[PDB]
């Protein structure tokens, strides 16, 4: 499948397959962003990490693209677990 | 963030953030499709399940919408932990 098709297939993976099979950020190079792994951590601490990143790690700063509202919204979604598109 | 923006953030989370933070299809009502859960099952078996579903379950068949290559690609993504590009 070509790049255009790959994109259509990732969408299907996230919307249709993910509906029944669920979606979770179980962690790879970076830590898990599951509600269980973020339990009890100050919310503003997680928003800070998103906006400014973590120096000397692969976690980049997203302030270049995300406002403080955007980062807080994402963090709320990670805390709830409701990451489904 | 407004309607259109929340969607951008959901997409960003699933396809950009999910690469490092390990997006997986698991935690839903349906079974886990993580690499750990598919480790022993043959690829052609999983591809068959995608194309033909599993009778007497809600796992539907996808052959009409997906070619054999499409299904094999999807399975590779499940196996290789590459739901985010
Ligand atoms: C609910 C309507 C589902 C949707 C939509 C999708 N899947 Fe599914 N899947 C579902 C169930 C209840 C089961 C288990 C069936 C059983 O009792 O054995 C499955 C199973 C699979 C498997 C097989 C996993 C295994 O261990 O053999 C695969 C490979 C799979 N599902 C993939 C898959 C894909 C790619 C989907 C989107 C195209 C998809 N499923 C949707 C429930 C549902
Ligand atoms: C690889 C290039 C990454 C991408 C892209 C994103 N994240 Fe990340 N993240 C990554 C690493 C290696 C780490 C750990 C850094 C360290 O100090 O060891 C992180 C960390 C986070 C955290 C903190 C989690 C915690 O338990 O405190 C969060 C909340 C986080 N990252 C969020 C996040 C978001 C929202 C991203 C997309 C906008 C994103 N990360 C991308 C690696 C990578």
Author numbering:
A (entry chain C), B (entry chain A): 4 to 88
Sentences from the paper on this structure:
Here, the crystal structure of NirC, a c-type cytochrome co-encoded with other proteins involved in nitrite reduction by the opportunistic pathogen Pseudomonas aeruginosa, has been determined. The iron cation is coordinated by His24 and Met62, which is consistent with mutagenesis studies performed using the orthologue from P. pantotrophus. Whereas NirM is absent in many NirS-producing bacteria and has been assigned to function as an electron transporter for the nitrite reductase, orthologs of NirC are found in nearly all NirS producers, but their function is subject to ongoing discussions.
Because the wild-type protein failed to crystallize, we attempted to reduce the surface entropy by mutating Glu71 to alanine, finally yielding cube-shaped crystals that diffracted anisotropically and possessed a very large orthorhombic unit cell. The crystals diffracted anisotropically to a maximum resolution of 2.12 Å (spherical resolution of 2.83 Å) and initial phases were obtained by Fe-SAD phasing, revealing the presence of 11 NirC chains in the asymmetric unit. Surprisingly, these protomers arrange into one monomer and two different types of 3D domain-swapped dimers, one of which shows pronounced asymmetry. In the three ‘far dimers’ the average iron–iron distance is 28.5 ± 0.2 Å, whereas it is 24.9 ± 0.1 Å in the two ‘close dimers’. In the dimers of NirC observed here, the GloA-score is 0.9 ± 0.2 Å for the far dimers, compared with 3.05 ± 0.01 Å for the close dimers; this is indicative of substantial asymmetry in the latter, which is readily discernible after the superposition of one protomer of a dimer onto the other. In NirC, the increased flexibility leads to antiparallel β-sheet-like interactions of Leu26, Arg27 and Leu28 in the far dimers and no interactions, but with elevated B factors of the hinge loop in the close dimers. Notably, dimerization does not have a major impact on the structure of the heme-binding site, indicating that monomers and dimers could display similar biochemical properties, as has already been found for other N-terminally domain-swapped cytochromes. Importantly, the mutation is not part of the dimer interfaces or the hinge loop, suggesting that it does not cause the simultaneous presence of different NirC oligomeric states observed here. However, the fact that we did not detect dimers even in highly concentrated solutions, together with the observation that crystallization took relatively long and required the introduction of a surface-entropy-reduction mutant that enabled crystal formation through new crystal contacts, currently argues for a crystallization artefact that points towards structural malleability of these proteins rather than a physiological importance of NirC dimers.
